[PDB]
Each structure stands twice: as C-alpha cells, then as structure tokens.
Design an enzyme around this catalytic site. Structure first.
Site, short mmCIF file in Angstrom:
data_model
loop_
_atom_site.label_atom_id
_atom_site.label_comp_id
_atom_site.label_asym_id
_atom_site.label_seq_id
_atom_site.Cartn_x
_atom_site.Cartn_y
_atom_site.Cartn_z
N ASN A 1 39.95 32.37 33.65
CA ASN A 1 41.35 32.41 33.28
C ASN A 1 41.69 31.29 32.33
OD1 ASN A 1 41.63 34.41 35.36
ND2 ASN A 1 41.38 32.66 36.72
N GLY B 1 41.18 38.92 48.43
CA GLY B 1 39.88 38.81 49.06
C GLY B 1 39.11 40.10 49.18
N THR B 2 39.83 41.20 49.34
CA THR B 2 39.18 42.50 49.34
C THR B 2 38.41 42.70 48.05
OG1 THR B 2 40.77 43.49 50.84
CG2 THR B 2 39.64 44.96 49.30
N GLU C 1 23.83 53.18 26.88
CA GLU C 1 23.11 52.62 25.77
C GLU C 1 23.07 51.12 25.91
OE1 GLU C 1 24.77 53.91 22.15
OE2 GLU C 1 23.05 53.38 20.89
N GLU D 1 45.66 44.49 50.72
CA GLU D 1 46.88 43.72 50.59
C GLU D 1 47.90 44.60 49.85
OE1 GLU D 1 45.44 40.01 48.90
OE2 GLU D 1 44.24 40.92 47.32
MG LIG Z 1 43.98 42.08 49.09
#
Ligand SMILES: [Mg+2]
EC number: 3.6.5.-
Lengths: 429, 441
Positions: free
Chosen positions: B206, B144-145, B254, B71
């Site tokens: 969020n 979405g990617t 670690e 996008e």
């Molecule tokens: Mg995208």
C-alpha cells in the site's frame, strides 16, 4: 449478529450503564419512549446488536440490572429514558452487600444469582449470534463485584465461547473510599484474572484530573464521569455498529491486543477533551488527536506509560479522514517514543477507523493500549492488603462471612504472580 | 469462450473488488442496473463483456465473480449500494463472525462453515461458463478470512478443476506500515499453504500506493478509495487481450510458465503508469519512452521492494492504446541497455510484448489523468525475497516468544505448522537464493 448485552452492578456502575444506554440512545436518536426519531436507517441498520425492537417498535436494551437493594432500581427507574426500558430486568436485592465481598458472593451472592442467570439466559436465547455482553462493577467491594464475580464464573462456564469485556472501578492509590477495598479487590481479582476476557481500568482520580485540568471543570460528579467513560465504551463497538474502511471487532481487538490471556487489563484514552474556549484556540487533526493519544494525562488509569512500557497500543477512530494520515502518524509515533514501545512486538501499534465519528464531533479517537505500568497498582493494593492482613484488620467482618484466609493467600501469591509475570515480559528482549 | 471469474475476500480485498467491477462496468459502460444504455449489435471476430458481465434475456448483465468473507458488514454496503441492481443475490456469500484475524479460524474454525456454499456457487458459474481460462481470486493477509478461508479456498478449488489458471491478487504486509501484529502468523501460515495451491500471483503493497499517488497522482490525503481505484486500473489492463484487440493479445496461461520460468518462485511486481494529474496531463507529453523508461523506475516500483537490489527475470509490458512495435521495441533495447539492471542470465531475454490498441479509460471522480498508452510491468526478479526475510525474522522472534500462539492453538493448528512453515520460507529463501546464483563457467 455479534449483538451483545449489558450487566451492571456496582455502587456506581449501576449508574454508569444508565448513562451509557442513555448515550447510545442519543447516537440512535430514538425517543425516550422507545421509537426512532432519527434521520438515517444506519442507526436502524445495526440497531439490534445493542437494542431490541418490540411489538409496536418499543426499542429496548439488552441490559441486565444487578443490585442488592432497589434504590438504584428506583433511581434509574426514575431515569429519563426510563420509559425506554423493560421492567423485566429490574433484578435487585433486599439487603445490600455491605461491601463485604463474601457477603455479596456467598451470602447474598448465592442468594439472588439464580433469578439473574435465568432471565439473562432468556436473553441468551434472545441473541442470535451473540458477540458478547458488557459487565460493569467496581473492583474494591461487593456492590458490583460481590455478585459479578459469580456472574463471570457462571456465564463463563455457561458460555465458554462468549466475550467477557469487564470494566470495574479501581481504587485510586490516594483516596480510600473504603478500607476493606484490598480484600474485596484481591479476592475478586483472583477470579477476574482467570475468568474475565477483557478488562479496562476504572480510576476516579484520573477522571477528576480529566475534568479539572483537561476538561477545566471545577464541579465533579459521577454522571459527567460516566459520560466520559461511556463515551469510550460506547465507541468500542462503532465499527461493529457501523461501517469502517478499517474495521476490527473485539475478537480482532483482543486477539490483536493480547499476547497471553493474563493481560486483559487495559488502559484507556479517549479524546478530544476541551472546555468551550479551546476550539477557538485549536482545531482538529488526526495528528492533533494523536498528540493527545499518547498523553499520560489522558492515560485514565493508575499506571504510567511514562514509567512502564507499552506492551501494546491501539487506536479507535470514528470519523471521515485520510488513513494515509492516520497510519503515518501511527508509525511516526511508534518511532518517536520507541523506548516505551516494547521491542519484539513489531508494529505494536494497530489501527482502525469508523466511517462515522460519534455524534457532535467530526473525528473520533480512542486508545486502549496495554503497557505493564499497572504493576504499581497491584503492588499498592496488595501492599495495603498485606499490612492490615498482618493486622487482620476487619477480618472479623470478613471471617464472619465464613471464608478462609488461605483464599486470601491464593489471590495473594496469585496476584503477586501476575505482577512479576508482567515484570518478566516487561524485562525482556 | 474466454472466461475468467473474480473472487473477493478480506476487508480491503472486497474493497478492491468493488472498485474493480465499478471499473469494468464503467469501461464497457453498461449501466449499473445491468443494462447497457443501448442495444447491442450482432457481430463476430472476438468476445466482448461476455467474459464477465453475464448475459440475460434482457438488459441484465451481471459479473462473473463471487464474494466470500466472514466479516459481512461492509459487503452489505454492496447489498445496499447503487449496484444493488447490478449484482445478484446468489452472487453474495458472507460469514457473520469473521476470523478475528485468526488465520486458523476462518481457515479451520469457521473454515468449515461456508465452503460448500462457495463451491456450489463456483459450479454454477463455471457450469455457466465454457472457456473459462482461469480464476481471479482476491483476498488479503489482513481481513482475516482473506488469509485463512481463502487458503482453504484455493486449497480445494485447485483440486476441483486444476486446469484453470490461478490469478492471484492479495495484499502483502507493508514493510513498516501495517494493520496488526499477527500478520506474521496470517502471512506465513498462508504461505506454506499458499504456494502449492497457487499458480502465480502478485503482491500489492500500500505504502507505494500512498507515496506514488501523492507524488505522481499529486495526492494529498488518500485511502482505500484511491488504492482500490489504482489496483482497479492495473487489473483493468492485465486482461485487456481477452477483452480488446491488441497486436499480441497474450494470455494468462501464456504468462504462466513463461514469466515464472521455474515452478517455485512464481510471484512478481507490477508498476503501472502513467498516473499523473490533469495539470501534468498538460505540461507533459507522456511518450512511449516516458512510460517505458519510467516503467522501470525503482522509485516507481509499485511494491516496496527495490528492483535495483534484485535481478529481473521477465517483463510483460502489455500496452494499452496507440503503441508501435518498433518504438517500444527499441525501448526494450534500452532496457537491455540499463547497466544497473541485471537479469537471470540463464534467461537472457524473456520478454513478451503486449500492444492492445485501446488506450486507457478514466473513472470520473478519479485522480489519474487521461493518456493514450498504458504499461503493465508484470516483472519478476530476485529482489523480493528480502521483505519476506523481514517477515520471517519478525515472525521469527515473535513466534519465538510464543506471542498470541494461544489464540491459534486454541483453534486447531499444530506447532509444527509454525516451525515447518518457517522451513517453507526457508526453502523459498533457498529458491530466491539459488535461482539468483549465476550458472557456473
Ligand atoms: Mg473478514
């Protein structure tokens, strides 16, 4: 580039897109002549995905003209911004469909499709990564639908990957601008349920209601109305046209809007809508416009969310705000009237924001939700079709086109099938 | 010597990245073009920027991170933004037509389209790097990617190097707030293909950012600017050891099989503080104990999953600034002291101190006030399984109704991926189910 095209037929729709491109020109502030006179490159950044520069900077539309009689071609040809056009696309007819849809679909349908699909195809080569194209007609006759049916079939085959977002005028239940409407309509809608990718309902009476009550206007015409709708249809690509902290395209939209492909008839809400004094009553908040968003009176379609149930709902926001508000009103509303929210679709409301609102306003709202209240719409129109098809009233104008009636049965039990289909989805949990 | 590199995906995701590199570049104060305001003196003892900001033969010091998402609009804003001297063209790889939030699209369909370019860029950087410990990968189950294409991304990148660490920052579907409804599909389809390609990663939600910025930052009306700023701080401190002197400059590797003792349930929470206002910076003192006791406020829990409903496993309270081993130490006794808290007893204590001596730096135009001490409670408990369960029940029904499935089946995924991925969260539900069981006798 996810650029797209427009194709309009339709006794009105040919005017509609005229207003539409007119509006987009304003939002790109390019002169009627076809050169830019604006103030930010941002209008030029994504200008191409609707427009097309020309040698010398003639900036042009990716529009396609449908008509069966040149009058509209002269009309918009007589149009301000008319010098912003390409003479090529003025593809019209010498006859007119007479709105017997078979006339505009076989008779003149087969007559003039070829020159269109050719030049359109030349536009297809003109498109780098075509997100789609915008068709426009009405779903009651043939002035648009006559041929537009053939368009959706042909290009749909010709471009099985492209988006087909279809707006066509729906006959209001009360006022019958023609009585052959059930037949054109039903015959079309058989096709459109199969072939069209997106559809949103286009009533007139809603637009009247908006202009008269909520616009508080006494003098309705088309042109204002197309202002009201090309407002929304113009908003739809905003993120696709301009940045947005929360962006979503038509693919993200429809895929994020439709559970099953038979449900791409969507209702529409855009706002704010005031007369001049109103601002000196009220001001703008996200919660405010939200308080319009779920208004049946902005529900610009013959379906009632108050009677049906939101299968889906979405918001198209253009402006500069705090999404912390936006979501908050979202979820708030998704509770507040939970009952008209379909159940097993959790978070059936969905979000968006464009960093810029449309010109002139600071914040934008758009709602293309999808309840299933349209069932009364199809039920009505199918009903009138049923009555006079009992009578075969004006079958003679019809069979004179040399169709069969069994097609009428096909779109008939067809369209009923789609209705009951929406019944079960509405009646389920 | 000690390198890491950041990867950015999904709308919110690269939003985060932009905030981040804005941040670090601010913090080493190298000017946006690529130069430092002044010459760099030759010294030794530890690395500097060299981790991420890329040395040129001149005042050109570009990050070691990569953008990938289908996008490509917004990323152009970086392509336009002030840091257009900062970044580098080949640093930029985007897709035109994104996934439409088809997981299966940018994962399958458009998944095929940009992978090789990505891997070549990775080879250019890692070949450019030497002691790159691990991989900073950012994406989102929304843009979405951020789910799909990232899923292939680790799916193959892991199989490329393997020995690098997987530093996973992606966002998780907020519990009741959301972005779409296919999120079930995005998430779980990601998850069964996420886990075995993931080393360890945290889940940022969020709504906590909102509630806490609005109360603790005293924020009235926030957005991704504030969010991206906040995650900017948290990642800003999660790696200071490789950037700055601290008493126990602990490291990612670690952290790996010590925070997440078993292999499976290897995610966690992260409630950073002290986030307060300028009017609470004054009218306050902000003790080590205040950050510390405050660090375990479930209401401070920076991902909307109640700690008090879970049982903690590990807590890497890496600290910025003037920290005392003793004072914190006794605070950790105080944490053993907390009756309400309950620990994977077969891991009685698993604590791991972090005392880095640089106190925090603030970003001008920000809302957080300035302090002397930072905490990162990267902690792992039993609690977080539940919201998952909401995810698989929501997705359970919606998938039962076959909703949207045409979209994905249209793009080249099979149904057993769906039901089986539900078996995946079944197993992980057995994992949070079992590891929380107290070992008998
Ligand atoms: Mg995208």
């Amino acid at each position: 580039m996810r650029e797209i095209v427009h194709i309009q037929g339709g006794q009105c729709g040919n005017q509609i897109g005229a207003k539409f491109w007119e509006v987009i020109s304003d939002e790109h502030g390019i002169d009627p002549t076809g050169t830019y006179h604006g103030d930010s490159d941002l209008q030029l950044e994504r200008i191409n995905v609707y427009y097309n520069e020309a040698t010398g900077g003639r900036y042009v539309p990716r529009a396609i003209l449908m008509d069966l009689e040149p009058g509209t071609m002269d009309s918009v040809r007589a149009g301000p911004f008319g010098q912003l056009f390409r003479p090529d696309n003025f593809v019209f007819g010498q006859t007119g469909a007479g709105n017997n849809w078979a006339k505009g679909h076989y008779t003149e349908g087969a007559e003039l499709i070829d020159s269109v699909l050719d030049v359109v195809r030349k536009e297809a080569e003109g498109c780098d990564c075509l997100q789609g194209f915008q068709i426009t007609h009405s779903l009651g006759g043939g002035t648009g639908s006559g041929m537009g049916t053939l368009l959706i079939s042909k290009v749909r085959e010709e471009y099985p990957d492209r988006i087909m977002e279809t707006f066509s005028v729906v006959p209001s239940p009360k006022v019958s601008d023609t009585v052959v409407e059930p037949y054109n309509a039903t015959l079309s809608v058989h096709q459109l349920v199969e072939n069209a990718d997106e559809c949103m309902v286009i009533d007139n009476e809603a637009l009247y209601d908006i202009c008269f009550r909520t616009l508080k206007l006494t003098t309705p015409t088309y042109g204002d109305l197309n202002h009201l709708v090309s407002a929304a249809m113009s908003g739809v690509t905003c993120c696709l046209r301009f940045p947005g902290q929360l962006n979503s395209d038509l693919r993200k939209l429809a895929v994020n809007l439709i559970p099953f492909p038979r449900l791409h008839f969507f209702m529409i809400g855009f706002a704010p809508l005031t007369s001049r004094g109103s601002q000196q009553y009220r001001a703008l908040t996200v919660p405010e416009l939200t308080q319009q968003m779920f208004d049946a009176k902005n529900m610009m379609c013959a379906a009632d969310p108050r009677h049906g149930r939101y299968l889906t709902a979405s918001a198209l926001f253009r402006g500069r705000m705090s999404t912390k508000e936006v979501d908050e009103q979202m979820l708030n509303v998704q509770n507040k009237n939970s009952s008209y929210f379909v159940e097993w679709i959790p978070n059936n409301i969905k979000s968006s924001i464009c960093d810029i609102p449309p010109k002139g306003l600071k914040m934008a709202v758009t709602f293309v939700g999808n309840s299933t209240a349209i069932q009364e719409m199809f039920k009505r129109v199918a009903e009138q079709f049923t009555a006079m098809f009992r009578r075969k009233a004006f079958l003679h104008w019809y069979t004179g086109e040399g169709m069969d009636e069994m097609e009428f049965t096909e779109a008939e039990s067809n369209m009923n099938d789609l209705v009951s289909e929406y019944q079960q989805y509405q009646d389920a949990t | 010597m000690r390198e890491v590199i950041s990867i950015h995906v999904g709308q919110g995701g690269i939003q985060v990245g932009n905030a981040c590199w804005e941040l670090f570049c601010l913090e080493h104060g190298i000017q946006p073009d690529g130069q430092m305001p002044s010459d760099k003196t030759i010294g030794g003892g530890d690395d500097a920027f060299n981790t991420f900001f890329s040395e040129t033969g001149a005042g050109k010091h570009v990050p070691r991170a990569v953008f990938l998402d289908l996008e490509p609009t917004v990323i152009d804003e970086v392509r336009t933004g002030t840091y257009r001297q900062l970044f580098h063209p080949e640093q930029l790889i985007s897709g035109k037509e994104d996934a439409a939030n088809n997981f299966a699209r940018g994962h399958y369909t458009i998944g095929k389209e940009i992978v090789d370019l990505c891997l070549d860029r990775i080879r250019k950087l890692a070949d450019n790097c030497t002691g790159l410990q691990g991989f900073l990968v950012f994406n989102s189950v929304g843009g979405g990617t951020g789910s799909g294409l990232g899923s292939l991304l680790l799916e193959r990148l892991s199989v490329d190097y393997g020995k690098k660490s997987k530093l996973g920052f992606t966002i998780y579907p907020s519990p009741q707030v959301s972005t779409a409804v296919v999120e079930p599909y995005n998430s779980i389809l990601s998850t069964h293909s996420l886990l075995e390609h993931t080393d360890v990663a945290v889940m940022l939600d969020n709504e906590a950012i909102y509630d806490i910025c609005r109360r603790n930052l005293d924020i009235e009306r926030p957005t991704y600017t504030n969010l991206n700023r906040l995650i900017a701080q948290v990642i800003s401190s999660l790696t200071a050891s490789l950037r700055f002197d601290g008493a126990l400059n602990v490291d990612i590797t670690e952290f790996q099989t010590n925070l997440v003792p078993y292999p499976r349930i290897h995610f966690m929470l992260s409630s950073y503080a002290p986030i307060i206002s300028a009017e609470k910076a004054y009218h306050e003192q902000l003790s080590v104990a205040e950050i510390t006791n405050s660090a375990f406020e479930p209401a401070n829990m920076m991902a909307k999953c109640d700690p008090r409903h879970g049982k903690y496993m590990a807590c890497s309270m890496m600290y910025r600034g003037d920290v005392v081993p003793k004072d914190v130490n006794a605070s950790i006794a105080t944490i053993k002291t907390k009756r309400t808290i309950q620990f994977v007893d077969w891991c009685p204590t698993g604590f791991k101190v972090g005392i880095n001596y640089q106190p925090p730096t603030v970003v001008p135009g920000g809302d957080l006030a300035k302090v002397m001490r930072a905490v990162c409670m990267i902690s792992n408990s039993t609690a977080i399984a539940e919201v998952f369960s909401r995810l698989d029940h929501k997705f359970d029904l919606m998938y039962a109704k076959r909703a949207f499935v045409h979209w994905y089946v249209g793009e080249g995924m099979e149904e057993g991926e769906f039901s089986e991925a539900r078996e995946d969260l079944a197993a992980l539900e057995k994992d949070y189910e079992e590891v929380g069981i107290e070992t008998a006798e």
